[PDB]
Design a protein around this ligand. Sequence first.
Ligand SMILES: Nc1ncnc2c1ncn2[C@@H]1O[C@H](COP(=O)(O)OP(=O)(O)O)[C@@H](O)[C@H]1O
Ligand SMILES: Nc1ncnc2c1ncn2[C@@H]1O[C@H](COP(=O)(O)OP(=O)(O)O)[C@@H](O)[C@H]1O
Ligand SMILES: Nc1ncnc2c1ncn2[C@@H]1O[C@H](COP(=O)(O)OP(=O)(O)O)[C@@H](O)[C@H]1O
Ligand SMILES: Nc1ncnc2c1ncn2[C@@H]1O[C@H](COP(=O)(O)OP(=O)(O)O)[C@@H](O)[C@H]1O
Ligand SMILES: Nc1ncnc2c1ncn2[C@@H]1O[C@H](COP(=O)(O)OP(=O)(O)O)[C@@H](O)[C@H]1O
Ligand SMILES: [Mg+2]
Ligand SMILES: [Mg+2]
Ligand SMILES: [Mg+2]
Ligand SMILES: [Mg+2]
Ligand SMILES: [Mg+2]
Lengths: 367, 367, 367, 367, 367
Amino acid sequence: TTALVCDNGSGLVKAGFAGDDAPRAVFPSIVGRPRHQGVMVGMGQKDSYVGDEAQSKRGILTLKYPIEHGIITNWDDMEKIWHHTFYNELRVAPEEHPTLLTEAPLNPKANREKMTQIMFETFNVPAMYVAIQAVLSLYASGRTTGIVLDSGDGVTHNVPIYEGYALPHAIMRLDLAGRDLTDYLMKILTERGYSFVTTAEREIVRDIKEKLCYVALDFENEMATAASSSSLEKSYELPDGQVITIGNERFRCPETLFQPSFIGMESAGIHETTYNSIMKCDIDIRKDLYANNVMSGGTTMYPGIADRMQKEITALAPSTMKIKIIAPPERKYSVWIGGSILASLSTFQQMWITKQEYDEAGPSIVH
Amino acid sequence: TTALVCDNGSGLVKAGFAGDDAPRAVFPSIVGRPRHQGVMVGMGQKDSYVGDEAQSKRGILTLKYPIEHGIITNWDDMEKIWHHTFYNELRVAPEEHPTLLTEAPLNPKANREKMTQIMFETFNVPAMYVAIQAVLSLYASGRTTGIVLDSGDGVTHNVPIYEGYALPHAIMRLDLAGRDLTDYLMKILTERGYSFVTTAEREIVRDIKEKLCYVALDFENEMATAASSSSLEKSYELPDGQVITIGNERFRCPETLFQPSFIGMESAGIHETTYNSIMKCDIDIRKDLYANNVMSGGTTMYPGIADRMQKEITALAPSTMKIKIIAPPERKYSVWIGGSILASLSTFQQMWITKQEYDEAGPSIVH
Amino acid sequence: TTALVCDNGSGLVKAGFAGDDAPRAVFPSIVGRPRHQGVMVGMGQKDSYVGDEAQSKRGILTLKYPIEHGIITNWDDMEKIWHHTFYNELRVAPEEHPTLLTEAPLNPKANREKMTQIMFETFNVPAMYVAIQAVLSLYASGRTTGIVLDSGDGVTHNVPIYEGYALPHAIMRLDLAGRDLTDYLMKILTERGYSFVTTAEREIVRDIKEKLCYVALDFENEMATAASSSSLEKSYELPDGQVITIGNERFRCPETLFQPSFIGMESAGIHETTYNSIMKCDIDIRKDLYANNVMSGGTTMYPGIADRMQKEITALAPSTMKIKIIAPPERKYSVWIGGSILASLSTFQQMWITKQEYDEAGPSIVH
Amino acid sequence: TTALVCDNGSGLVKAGFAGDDAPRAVFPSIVGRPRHQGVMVGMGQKDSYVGDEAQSKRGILTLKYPIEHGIITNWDDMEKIWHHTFYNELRVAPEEHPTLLTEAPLNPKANREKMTQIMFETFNVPAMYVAIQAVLSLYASGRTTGIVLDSGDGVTHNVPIYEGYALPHAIMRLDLAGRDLTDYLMKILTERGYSFVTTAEREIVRDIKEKLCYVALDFENEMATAASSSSLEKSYELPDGQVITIGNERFRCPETLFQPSFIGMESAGIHETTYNSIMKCDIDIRKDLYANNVMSGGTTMYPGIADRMQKEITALAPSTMKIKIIAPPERKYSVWIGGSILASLSTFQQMWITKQEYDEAGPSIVH
Amino acid sequence: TTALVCDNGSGLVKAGFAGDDAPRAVFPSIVGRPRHQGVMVGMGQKDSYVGDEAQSKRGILTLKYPIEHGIITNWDDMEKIWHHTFYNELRVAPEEHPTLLTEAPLNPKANREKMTQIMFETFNVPAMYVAIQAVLSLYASGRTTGIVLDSGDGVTHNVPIYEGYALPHAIMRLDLAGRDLTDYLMKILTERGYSFVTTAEREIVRDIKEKLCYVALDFENEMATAASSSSLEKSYELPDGQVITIGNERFRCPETLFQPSFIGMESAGIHETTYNSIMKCDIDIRKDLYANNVMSGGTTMYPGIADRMQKEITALAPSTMKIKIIAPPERKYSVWIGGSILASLSTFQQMWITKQEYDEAGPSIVH
Ligand SMILES: Nc1ncnc2c1ncn2[C@@H]1O[C@H](COP(=O)(O)OP(=O)(O)O)[C@@H](O)[C@H]1O
Ligand SMILES: Nc1ncnc2c1ncn2[C@@H]1O[C@H](COP(=O)(O)OP(=O)(O)O)[C@@H](O)[C@H]1O
Ligand SMILES: Nc1ncnc2c1ncn2[C@@H]1O[C@H](COP(=O)(O)OP(=O)(O)O)[C@@H](O)[C@H]1O
Ligand SMILES: Nc1ncnc2c1ncn2[C@@H]1O[C@H](COP(=O)(O)OP(=O)(O)O)[C@@H](O)[C@H]1O
Ligand SMILES: Nc1ncnc2c1ncn2[C@@H]1O[C@H](COP(=O)(O)OP(=O)(O)O)[C@@H](O)[C@H]1O
Ligand SMILES: [Mg+2]
Ligand SMILES: [Mg+2]
Ligand SMILES: [Mg+2]
Ligand SMILES: [Mg+2]
Ligand SMILES: [Mg+2]
């Protein structure tokens, strides 16, 4: 009889019932067909592996992300993610609940429809409601105010919300992190001879992004001392035998997040987009948009931020302003801890769209 | 009514019904015509002895192998092998079954056609299927993963297979063992006065290859102490009166398998071809390609391997990697214990080519 | 007193003074040691033959390419290439000039250093400058705009340049042609029994790639009709007696350039990488990136391109766009006809690095 | 209507129909003219007596052997042998049968022709076939394998035959026994004063060779004790009055068969020629060429052999080899018991040469 | 003070100082003991005649070749060859020089040791070096390339050498000419009644091999017309009275060199061993291994070859290949004209083994 909060990101999909902790189930959200012909009977071999097995059996597959920079590529793969998940994982009936879905803040509609509809006719969840992914990130620390800087693979957003309404027109969306960070790392690792060309192997790059990373505080001056013999290099070992020693670029790569000329895209860094998004609000409210940046996603896990972000803003921000940049631990699940709280809470159950109200208007009314 | 798994190697041809133990019949696979004129009435004397009698009455024949380094030389002898076998040995009708054949992995087509076709019109087995000889060697201990090193007279192969699909391009085929090992032993036995010129007599060389052999662990250092008077020589006795004492070279000859400069061939040793075939796969998978080399054939019967193979690879292989080099006893019939399991197993019976489907395409479609 | 533009490719190394025609000297760039022991006094025999003689006396050597897939393997052989070239060929002093070198566009540094440095202290060329190999290929027909597709053994590149700046991030580098094309041809020639195992012998394969080749226009439909008896096969004659007749596969092998599944590599074909590199530029500029593909290298010598490339792009490219694929004759020397023009031209002479400026920084400043 | 197997030796010519026992007629094969003038009316006396009467009336003749050491001397006497035999003995018509003759294995051709032809035109036997004297000696006890040592006056042979073809080149023919043994005995009997100068009288010597003979086992040690007074001498009585007592040399003379220095011929003894013929065969076959020496002729009648031959061989033969020296009783007719079996047996009747096939080629085709 | 190049063949041993023409001394290389008892005081009679007197006084000896089919039988006779030669012929001191010896290419070691050592301790030549008999045959006409077919009694070899290193493994050694040709001629001369049993007399056979011999061009067809009465027979006269008339077989006997079935040996003729050795090299080099067969020895003195050899090869060789078969006059001393050039030439003097360097290693190091 439960209700299910299921967030589709380009993750790391998260699923777990209406509370109370963290997603019961998390997996990399990939389908990969076998790029070769199989010959050991059964037929045994699957037509396509979904996660998590499609992350355990790389190299013999071609990973294809069903979603990509917010808008998904095709629901043929997406629906299979879904069907696989509801039926053979959580062991939850389709008529169990009214569900709660998330999207990007400005994703081209109808990218919400085709989802809502296919999921509606196939899985027959008797209702529906979609809350934007940024808004939910506030329900983590349970604040009512603040500018939310939510960056996960592969779409970031900067949505300012006051108590308790939210300014719609003051939001700037950058197509930056994180596949561009993975790809940039893969492009600058070539500087030391390591070739990471194939689709499957790209995943390994992401892991060297995981452990071996830190954002400097004063890049321009730090680069000089990086050349000094003292190793700012840590050597990671790769799933086979190989031992790879990356340094210098280790702190260079994430820095791309600010100063994103390195990628060849003109929109200025998160540095500047935060401020320029804030002074797109009303002059009076700004006092409390500052000192309340609450970060989220899986791309605020770097040991660089937030005091990088801090010294960076304080140079651009007006003077005489106190700026706490409170960002929790556990942030990777922040959004989810949001959603859980919501559908269990009174009373927005009655701003849902049930079945009777999908026979009248249908594809519209969703917004 | 049974089905028959029959493998043609440069053996030692093996035949036995769809399971369950080992070939019912094994013989050296030779035809040899009598190099002399016969005068003992009847006419009595046969035009040519096939095995096994052609291995019991050597010296009065000129042994001619119907196949040689993978591709067969002529089907005139080959078909006669076949007809003789089916009709006067196994006592099996031609319409008894649909059959199962093996080939080399990269044998020049149409070396499979002329066989399939001649056997199709002559012996009329109402169906057909040819599985590659390396793949079958996994079905012995019933593993699903691994790089298979299958080396028999006279073509070796190195096929890496993951679970369960098989990488086609990571296979390197060396025309090495085993006639070159026989011929080389015959070339290095000459230094001690033993002349082994005649075709028939060469078989005897092969037998001294059998019993009197062992691969060292550290050749270069072992050779010094080999010169010491202490006999690492065992004296074998030859079918006539002669007593032959070979030492030193007894372990030198097989060593040719690595470091095949001794032959005057540039392709590097099995040592290097194993690794060089392995890192021709995808970087992530190698962890399990290692520690599962399953050897097969009749040339992995030396009491040297695998800790020779082991110590050698570990020097070329990356560090910190565990390498089991599991190779069964009973390996001589490994391939066959594979085949039996296959055609008896559901359900790939419907991946066959029967008679009705050889009326359409014919010489093609076999692959 | 002249200045020398010397480009190291995996060629076919090219050398000739600052203009005005084509390299004075071209040779296959190989060192090969004699795999055997020599016994006719002098000592006569060299420790290792460099080109061109190392291409006249194959079979008694083991050819070892000093560079391989962009990054060179070792400067021990490379330096000998150099020393041999400067001293005993062109008859040019080391202090004669400031020089001009090329590299790959994204070659792992320091693959440019060790060269620059060893060449700097050994040969003492009082200056230096290295222009990327793609950029020079535009100076042939003397265009200022276009996407350059430069594919030679053994690294291709796709660099888009506008007037007159060049987009750095829109370049995709495929490790495809040409040793993979040679090796693939050698791998599919085995299908008809021809064994091409030895290192030296591989060269002959390359020559059958030369004359006997052509890329089809509609492969999928062409393969059927290829089976028809009408010979699309031309019979080539081999340096010894043997006459080898390759057909069908004659056009199949080069086709690998597109669809590189045949090799077992996932990175999509040149077809798709050209386009995917182009629409990684800015949306407005694309109008002139199209209709100006200028091809180069020695692997765009097939009589297939460019209208194979054309029909292929027009299927992937947006509609209503005219796509010229201008690629000169003489392309094999295109790069060089570029370089010569450059160092003779004002004024980038003062963007050089002379000796006085290598006592300060050294290993840095080169980029 | 029967067929006749007739063997010409330097005997003791043997004749008897196609089976089934032994020759119907045996006689010493000599013609002898009367060396004196005859004067007792008739004129009565024959121009020349053939055997057997020419062996009843010695002393009044000059015995002249029609054949001598394989090659016959002249067919003028030989034909007279034949005509006399066929017409006035067996009482058989000339057109009765197709005939079967033997020769030496290596008798100088055409020593077979002049026979075949003369008998063909004179006696008109409508067909012909000539089988070699050695091969037939196997047909006695009906074995299929073995080295045959056939020594009769006056040409021995050593032919190795395997089952069932026969090695032609491994045969060594010594012009030794038996007229050389007779002549030697006559040469050493002078040692005790007995004069045997005349040709006729020589026959008597042969008889003292018959009864009074034995081959020692250890000559050298036996010779010492032979000198002891103990009579190893048996006293034979000669057709006239005289009583001759020979000892010592009685066993010395036959020993000449081995150690034939005594004659002044260097070619080593039958002892060594057996072995030296055997190891002129193939290395594999020797195992069964040994242990199957089947003797024949009339010079293997000595009570010394075969265990003399044995102790001699085992010292020369390789060790650990079992050597049967099987020699029947009745051996004197061995060859003939062969022929009977042959021409009576199907089916080699059609390997004959009849007359219709002798008008075409004639003197040729016989081989 | 000169140095001596001395070649031991089964000849015809040749000796003459370091250049410049031909051996000062040549003789048939035989020792022969007197098979009889001598009674003419002095003691007068020698214990054993070495050549040449042992070739002047046949018939009173038992000729025993000190070497036989490459490996020598015993150094007791060989040493006497040596001592006799150095001391009572060339009038040369033992310490005069460092010496140069030849061997077969694949003679069973240690067949070089026992020589090197005995000669070293007895004759005390302060150094040593042994070059293989085949290689020297190139130094005659002074070529650098080619496959050498060096056939003398009683071991032929086929050693292919490129410029300038030498392929070791492409050599096939046939135990053929010449004692097998002498013996074969003696075996087929019996066909016309001539008996040649004794060893001494065999020398005469060899002489009839000398003058009265010639190899046909198209044998099988030549035999038909050979039967025609027109004498292709030349009549030789024998040292006693006897006149011997040989025909037919006169050209048949040498023909045995190809098609050695006549002997009963399975290894195919020199015909095939030349080609089969050539295509045992690398594919590229063959172009110049052809058209450069330089023959040597004493068995290429037949007036048949080389256009026999030519027509034979061209039928087996691949088409469109030019095949010169250059073989000098004067060839009998070719090898020696080689040796002279060598030890006189710089600089391989320092690849010798002297006195000081034989106290350390001894029996080894010779190779
Ligand atoms: N510890 C970490 N350090 C750095 N980056 C991380 C870490 N954990 C996850 N990431 C990155 O965060 C991304 C996942 O973010 P996620 O919150 O799943 O975004 P979404 O919810 O939009 O899918 C991954 O692409 C990964 O590269
Ligand atoms: N105990 C042994 N030691 C070494 N080699 C052996 C042994 N037993 C057999 N062989 C060799 O193995 C070969 C048989 O291999 P096999 O597995 O039959 O190859 P295939 O199946 O391809 O014919 C024989 O030629 C023989 O020389
Ligand atoms: N006529 C031709 N057809 C096809 N390929 C060719 C032809 N001529 C040369 N090639 C190939 O082009 C390559 C030479 O390219 P090159 O311009 O030297 O590249 P790089 O300069 O990077 O070494 C050689 O590897 C050769 O295989
Ligand atoms: N008991 C015997 N002992 C020794 N020699 C004998 C004996 N009987 C016969 N011979 C010899 O054997 C010869 C006859 O043997 P035979 O088989 O006829 O020889 P061939 O077949 O060559 O004519 C006679 O010359 C005779 O001297
Ligand atoms: N003119 C000739 N014709 C045929 N054969 C010959 C001729 N001269 C010599 N021979 C044979 O060739 C042999 C000489 O070969 P040789 O070159 O001396 O070999 P090696 O030098 O190895 O002893 C002799 O034994 C002889 O029988
Ligand atoms: Mg998100
Ligand atoms: Mg096999
Ligand atoms: Mg290039
Ligand atoms: Mg006889
Ligand atoms: Mg010789």
